[PDB]
Amino acid sequence: MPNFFIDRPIFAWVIAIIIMLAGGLAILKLPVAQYPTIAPPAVTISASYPGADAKTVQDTVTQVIEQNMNGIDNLMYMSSNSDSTGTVQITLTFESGTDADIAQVQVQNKLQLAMPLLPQEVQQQGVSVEKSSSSFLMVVGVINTDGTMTQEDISDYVAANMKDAISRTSGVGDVQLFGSQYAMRIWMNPNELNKFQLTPVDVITAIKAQNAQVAAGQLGGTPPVKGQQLNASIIAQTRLTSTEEFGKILLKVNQDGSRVLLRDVAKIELGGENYDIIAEFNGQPASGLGIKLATGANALDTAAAIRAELAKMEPFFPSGLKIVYPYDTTPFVKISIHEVVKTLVEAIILVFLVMYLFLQNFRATLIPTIAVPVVLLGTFAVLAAFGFSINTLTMFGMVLAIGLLVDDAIVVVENVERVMAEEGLPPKEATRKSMGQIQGALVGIAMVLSAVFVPMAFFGGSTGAIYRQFSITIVSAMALSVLVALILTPALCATMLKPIAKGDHGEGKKGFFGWFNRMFEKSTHHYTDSVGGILRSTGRYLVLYLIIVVGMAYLFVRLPSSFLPDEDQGVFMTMVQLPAGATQERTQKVLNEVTHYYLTKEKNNVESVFAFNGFGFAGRGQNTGIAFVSLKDWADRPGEENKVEAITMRATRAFSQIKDAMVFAFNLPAIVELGTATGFDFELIDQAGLGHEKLTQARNQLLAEAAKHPDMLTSVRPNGLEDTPQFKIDIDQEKAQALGVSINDINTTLGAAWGGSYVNDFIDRGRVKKVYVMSEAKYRMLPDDIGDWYVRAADGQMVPFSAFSSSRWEYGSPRLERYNGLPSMEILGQAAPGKSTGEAMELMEQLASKLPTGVGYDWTGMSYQERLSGNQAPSLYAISLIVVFLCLAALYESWSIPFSVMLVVPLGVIGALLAATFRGLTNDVYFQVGLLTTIGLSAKNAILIVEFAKDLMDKEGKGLIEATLDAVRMRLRPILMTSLAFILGVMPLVISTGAGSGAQNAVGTGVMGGMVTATVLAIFFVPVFFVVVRRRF
């Protein structure tokens, strides 16, 4: 096939041109993202049951729903929780790769079995199932610049005029509203109601009759009488619109003709729907949107559309409104992609400089260079066909390939150059002779290098998703490289190589060239003399091989394990928790302290602080808070002391002095779709019916012991609220019937006054908004306030609420969690600095072993993937070695040769482990790629010797010692040139220190150590192994 294109040079360029432009068009259409879809899909269920406590809700709603959820396809684990507000959340996580839409249908199909069994209050409220994620894509904040309008005014304008428009765009999956739409609030005064002999029941009935909308028939009608000439619609009572109209509602007319109106026994005010969430931005009132992208949508494209949309409606804002972006992750994605591209263009320059160093003229060193753009652009076309997307993982694939694919053209160009010097053959004739003796060598390298990366792509789990990106890039690049080297290089090099004098070695060359050649050639002569004494006796060097194998085993078991590393994304979060029973005001005081510290001590780094009150993780409550912190640009934060890890370490050590509060700060996880914070995630699960109180004692015992080892465990904290007192009133219906008071009136009066009620809806500028009834704030703050209310009896007299009721105090947990249908409690924390998450996970299993009988443990979220990843690691290596062994056996018809090559692999692995230990890295997902790559390139060096000696053996009849020496003497030059090119190729990755450099360091360091020993040591042991195996057979 190569001989076909030597006589057809113009045809050869056509293939290269077509591939080059095909990749270019694919670049203009491929999507861009930081990572592929590696998170497993999740489906959530929401429900409500107002008025019920946490314990009642779990046994009546949560337990029933989860009982019927067994038997779904590809179910990983299920978790749920309930709280005192009556809300229920059940989340199911499916295996990675499962279609979300099919799973969402399946869970909805099964849920309908248990729907009628739920209380009718739950059915009327309504339940829903939908896909969900645990993190926001971005947060858009709205503030008022002049402070002319309050907090709820900001929220309503966004809710009524902004929120619906955003969701009408593509990519958006769900939007969270930090506030509430307007709603007509009526604050009753219990003293005024008692004076006019009225009850909240009378107010409720009056509103429902004075604020309704009814229909009526058409005046013309159908069927019509003969000759009717008109047709019109009758209009009747309609809904009210303004607060001035609500003041006209008539409650009761006195016997003397006096009238009492709703304006006279209550304050009519337009306000919010819920007051349990208070937001603040840099100490100013604000409201905002929590927007999360839909499953399968592009992150960058969605963000670009959102920013465009806000520009559309911005000019129509009322004076004093502006948009703020306190939380965003897209700038990190933009920077990370740009950094790697800069790294890639730096690596290709380094490779070119190495090529020119070996005495080569300018015209010669070009020949292998044109292959680089072709294979890279050709790789992009393959990605487009299969539907992949450009990402950081695919970025690393070709970066490793740049220093690994050039050798295909190097062998051809170097060998024909040697033929020119040794024989003085004409260029066209010499090229027609060179490819005959290297054709098997070329296909061998590509076929071996593709062998390691093929079996890795079939593994499942989130780890398998990472693996597929590397395999598709390396294999496609390798297949293209052998093609382009065989199809293009011999044709172009056939005529490009100008005549060269026979025997010329560049003795009089200028510069370093005049000295470099003499030293290299002299070193080559010395090397063969050194090798000659090696074959004299193999006993000594065989012993040294054993000590290396033992040495690498010792290093392997000492390396700590971990999952994907974390990067300074420019944003981190702070969590605040207070003791049980803390009011909203007390929490606000602490949040002022935490927001005052950042803007005074860390003013050089932080930019803005977005604080929430009431909302937060581990359930909603008045004693919980959260704050988002956004840092400045990376270019304005020099050094390491101004990074996220350094800042958050100093913050926690300073907030520990806050009395009567728990404050922590932490970085976001590696991927924000599984967990809310970095580090492990530990679940303590009861599995023997111990009971809630006994389970709590075990949890306290475990974390108390964990506090005894601060040097490996830090920031250990529960993820649930503590026990709180409850105030329950006992109603005596026996006395109620004696006095003549309806039970419904008592229940309605208590519920409406203290908890509020929803009555009707009214029209506000064309919208539809709720109407609520509540007692005034200063009448429902103390237990003694119940003595002020009254209820009307059938006789017409007032009776105090204390005449037939009594109260007492109780205790009860405000939140309960369940794991896989069993009661459980969550524990969170972080590893100590200098340690690894693997060490922390190992330590806790030892601590959990001393727990009382009947309680177990299980990992979830972030930790679950790490446990799964480490279990399947041994299987990955075993399969790869078997495929390589069989692959080599096809290429040479002998079992002996693969044994010789295989024994070189340990010499390559020891290099990676030694490099990792010096840099203090951890055996993680990226390290797995390095070891697999180390297998391929270690065997690549051994191939260039064993194949050349074999041909010189059976085709020339040379002796075994003679054949081994000849191959080493002639193949020394290509080995050094290729290995040096690869080493300088990954130079930028190791030395990189910019944004997102943690991931680059892990990939580069592991492979870097492998090459060094795979060249220095293998160039000695390969002759030994080849002789020993051949002698045995």
Dihedrals φ, ψ of 815, to 5°?
-155, 140
Single out the residue in 73, 107, 132 at which a domain terminates. 132
Same domain, 455 and 417: yes
Q: What gap in Å lies between CA 520 and CA 901, rounded to an integer?
A: 27
Same domain, 372 and 289: no
C-alpha separations of 643 from 566, 604, 835 in Å: 12, 12, 19
Label residue 258 left, alpha or beta by phi (over 0 means left) and psi (-120 to 50 means alpha).
Answer: beta
Label residue 133 left, alpha or beta by phi (over 0 means left) and psi (-120 to 50 means alpha).
Answer: beta
Which structure tokens are listed for 13? Answer: 């360029």
Which structure tokens are listed for 590? Answer: 């602490």
Q: What gap in Å lies between CA 130 and CA 567, rounded to an integer?
A: 31
Dihedrals φ, ψ of 142, to 5°?
-125, 125
Q: What gap in Å lies between CA 676 and CA 191, rounded to an integer?
A: 49
Query: Which amino acid does the sequence have at 778?
Result: K
Q: What gap in Å lies between CA 839 and CA 712, rounded to an integer?
A: 8
C-alpha separations of 820 from 69, 90, 93, 693 in Å: 10, 11, 11, 20
Residue 620 class from Cβ within 10 Å (0-12 exposed, 13-18 middle, 19+ buried)?
A: middle
Same domain, 647 and 709: no
Label residue 511 left, alpha or beta by phi (over 0 means left) and psi (-120 to 50 means alpha).
Answer: left
Q: What gap in Å lies between CA 320 and CA 147, rounded to an integer?
A: 8
Chain centroid to Cα 731, Å, comes to 52
Which structure tokens are listed for 810? Answer: 């109780």
CB 446 within 8 A of CB 482: yes
Same domain, 365 and 487: yes
Residue 664 class from Cβ within 10 Å (0-12 exposed, 13-18 middle, 19+ buried)?
A: buried
Dihedrals φ, ψ of 546, to 5°?
-65, -40
Which structure tokens are listed for 514? Answer: 């005049």
Residue 766 class from Cβ within 10 Å (0-12 exposed, 13-18 middle, 19+ buried)?
A: exposed
Dihedrals φ, ψ of 139, to 5°?
-130, 130
Which structure tokens are listed for 559? Answer: 């390396």
| Full 3-state SS string of 93-142 | EECCCCCHHHHHHHHHHHHCCCCCCCCHHHHHHCCEEEECCCCCCEEEEE
- Looking up tokens 């459980």 gives 824
Q: What gap in Å lies between CA 934 and CA 1003, rounded to an integer?
A: 12
* 768: three-class secondary structure by DSSP: strand
Q: What is the tally of structural domains in the chain?
A: 6
Query: Which amino acid does the sequence have at 618?
Result: A
Q: Which of 608, 620, 629 is CA-nearest to residue 584?
A: 620
- Cα-based torsion angle of the residue sequence 491, 493, 497, 500 in order, rounded to the nearest 10 degrees: -110
DSSP 8-state code for residue 665:
E
CB 982 within 8 A of CB 404: yes
Span between the terminal Cα atoms of the chain, in Å: 36
CATH number of the domain that residue 150 is part of: 3.30.70.1320
C-alpha separations of 712 from 648, 651, 838, 842, 861 in Å: 18, 19, 11, 11, 21
- According to DSSP, the residues that pair with 667 across neighbouring strands are 572
Resolution in A: 3.5
Q: Which of 474, 405, 416, 415 is CA-nearest to residue 445?
A: 405
* Residue 856: inside a domain: yes
CB 837 within 8 A of CB 831: yes
HSE of 479 in the Cβ direction (CA atoms, 13 Å)?
13
Q: What gap in Å lies between CA 786 and CA 806, rounded to an integer?
A: 10
* Residue 335: inside a domain: yes
* 633: three-class secondary structure by DSSP: coil
Same domain, 155 and 165: yes
Query: Which amino acid does the sequence have at 593?
Result: E
Same domain, 904 and 817: no
Q: What is the DSSP string of 41-87?
A: PEEEEEE--TT--HHHHIIIIIHHHHHT-TT-TTEEEEEEEEETTS-
- According to DSSP, the residues that pair with 260 across neighbouring strands are 252
Q: What gap in Å lies between CA 69 and CA 78, rounded to an integer?
A: 9
Q: What gap in Å lies between CA 859 and CA 842, rounded to an integer?
A: 12
Q: What gap in Å lies between CA 281 and CA 286, rounded to an integer?
A: 6
Q: Which of 722, 729, 844 is CA-nearest to residue 785?
A: 729
Q: What gap in Å lies between CA 847 and CA 703, rounded to an integer?
A: 9
HSE of 719 in the Cβ direction (CA atoms, 13 Å)?
18
Inter-helix orientation angle 905-919/1018-1032, to 10° = 150
Same domain, 937 and 975: yes
Q: What gap in Å lies between CA 629 and CA 517, rounded to an integer?
A: 60
**Whats the size of the chain, residue-wise?**
1033
Q: What gap in Å lies between CA 1011 and CA 911, rounded to an integer?
A: 7
- Looking up tokens 């051949």 gives 1030
DSSP 8-state code for residue 766:
T
* Residue 228: inside a domain: no
Dihedrals φ, ψ of 639, to 5°?
80, 180
C-alpha separations of 764 from 155, 183, 208, 243 in Å: 15, 9, 18, 10
Q: Which of 723, 687, 679, 719 is CA-nearest to residue 703?
A: 719
Helices (H), 573-656: 584-598, 644-655
- Count CB atoms within 10 A of the CB of residue 650: 13
* Residue 506: inside a domain: no
Same domain, 177 and 142: yes
DSSP 8-state code for residue 605:
T
* Residue 508: inside a domain: no
Q: Which of 890, 853, 492, 490 is CA-nearest to residue 690?
A: 853
Q: What gap in Å lies between CA 674 and CA 946, rounded to an integer?
A: 49
CB 587 within 8 A of CB 578: yes
Query: What is the maximal distance between C-alpha atoms in the chain?
Result: 133
Q: Which of 111, 112, 114, 118 is CA-nearest to residue 86?
A: 118
- Count CB atoms within 10 A of the CB of residue 748: 17
CB 253 within 8 A of CB 259: yes
Which structure tokens are listed for 103? Answer: 């799973």
CB 432 within 8 A of CB 1015: no
Query: Which amino acid does the sequence have at 64?
Result: V
**Cβ within 8 Å of residue 345, ≥6 positions away:** none
C-alpha separations of 710 from 164, 585, 833 in Å: 49, 34, 11
**Cβ within 8 Å of residue 781, ≥6 positions away:** none
CATH number of the domain that residue 433 is part of: 1.20.1640.10
Q: What gap in Å lies between CA 97 and CA 39, rounded to an integer?
A: 9
Same domain, 699 and 784: no
Residue 38 class from Cβ within 10 Å (0-12 exposed, 13-18 middle, 19+ buried)?
A: buried
Cis amide bond preceding 223, omega within 30: yes
Q: Which of 475, 488, 482, 484 is CA-nearest to residue 383?
A: 475
CB 914 within 8 A of CB 1009: yes
Q: What is the DSSP string of 812-873?
A: E-SEEEEETTEEEEEEEEEEPTTS-HHHHHHHHHHHHTTSPTTEEEEE-THHHHHHHHHHSH
- According to DSSP, the residues that pair with 713 across neighbouring strands are 831
Dihedrals φ, ψ of 735, to 5°?
-75, -25
Which structure tokens are listed for 780? Answer: 């429902």
Number of H helices, E strands in the chain: 38, 28
Long-range contacts, stretch 835-839, CB < 8 angstroms, 24+ apart: 835/560, 835/712, 836/560, 836/561, 836/562, 836/922, 837/561, 837/562, 837/563, 837/679, 837/680, 837/863, 837/866, 838/560, 838/561, 838/562, 838/866, 838/870, 838/922, 838/923, 839/560, 839/712
* 700: three-class secondary structure by DSSP: helix
* Residue 997: inside a domain: yes
**Cβ within 8 Å of residue 883, ≥6 positions away:** 451, 452, 454, 455
CATH number of the domain that residue 117 is part of: 3.30.70.1430
Q: Which of 286, 339, 70 is CA-nearest to residue 157?
A: 286
**Cβ within 8 Å of residue 884, ≥6 positions away:** 448, 451, 452, 902, 935, 939
Same domain, 536 and 575: no
**Cβ within 8 Å of residue 248, ≥6 positions away:** 261, 262, 263
CB 641 within 8 A of CB 568: no
Which structure tokens are listed for 613? Answer: 């009150």
Which structure tokens are listed for 580? Answer: 């049980």
Single out the residue in 471, 501, 531 at which a domain terminates. 501
**Cβ within 8 Å of residue 1033, ≥6 positions away:** 896
Helices (H), 358-488: 362-366, 371-386, 392-405, 407-423, 427-434, 439-453, 461-487
Dihedrals φ, ψ of 881, to 5°?
-65, -40
* Residue 930: inside a domain: yes
Q: What gap in Å lies between CA 273 and CA 473, rounded to an integer?
A: 54
Beta strands at 250-253 and 571-577: parallel, antiparallel or unpaired: unpaired
C-alpha separations of 230 from 217, 235, 236, 540, 939 in Å: 14, 16, 19, 117, 96
Residue 467 class from Cβ within 10 Å (0-12 exposed, 13-18 middle, 19+ buried)?
A: buried
Q: What gap in Å lies between CA 509 and CA 923, rounded to an integer?
A: 48
Helix (H) or strand (E) segment spanning residue 1024: helix 1018-1032
Helix (H) or strand (E) segment spanning residue 608: strand 606-613
- Looking up tokens 């619609």 gives 233
Which structure tokens are listed for 318? Answer: 């009322």
CB 825 within 8 A of CB 817: yes
Beta strands at 138-144 and 88-94: parallel, antiparallel or unpaired: unpaired
CB 77 within 8 A of CB 68: no
CB 249 within 8 A of CB 130: no
Residues followed by a break in the chain, C–N over 2.5 Å? none
CATH number of the domain that residue 821 is part of: 3.30.70.1440
* Residue 565: inside a domain: no
- According to DSSP, the residues that pair with 390 across neighbouring strands are 32
Q: Which of 729, 738, 745, 754 is CA-nearest to residue 806?
A: 729
Beta strands at 75-83 and 88-94: parallel, antiparallel or unpaired: antiparallel
Dihedrals φ, ψ of 915, to 5°?
-65, -40
Query: Which amino acid does the sequence have at 751?
Result: G
CB 568 within 8 A of CB 644: yes
**Cβ within 8 Å of residue 200, ≥6 positions away:** 188, 193, 748, 749, 752, 753, 773
- Looking up tokens 């396809």 gives 73
CB 589 within 8 A of CB 663: no
Query: Which amino acid does the sequence have at 79?
Result: S
Residue 435 class from Cβ within 10 Å (0-12 exposed, 13-18 middle, 19+ buried)?
A: buried
- Cα-based torsion angle of the residue sequence 998, 1001, 1003, 1007 in order, rounded to the nearest 10 degrees: -170
- Count CB atoms within 10 A of the CB of residue 683: 22
CB 331 within 8 A of CB 34: no
Same domain, 460 and 526: no
Same domain, 159 and 106: no
Q: Which domain holds residue 117?
A: 40-132
Q: Which of 81, 178, 172 is CA-nearest to residue 131?
A: 172
According to the entry, how was the structure determined? cryo-EM
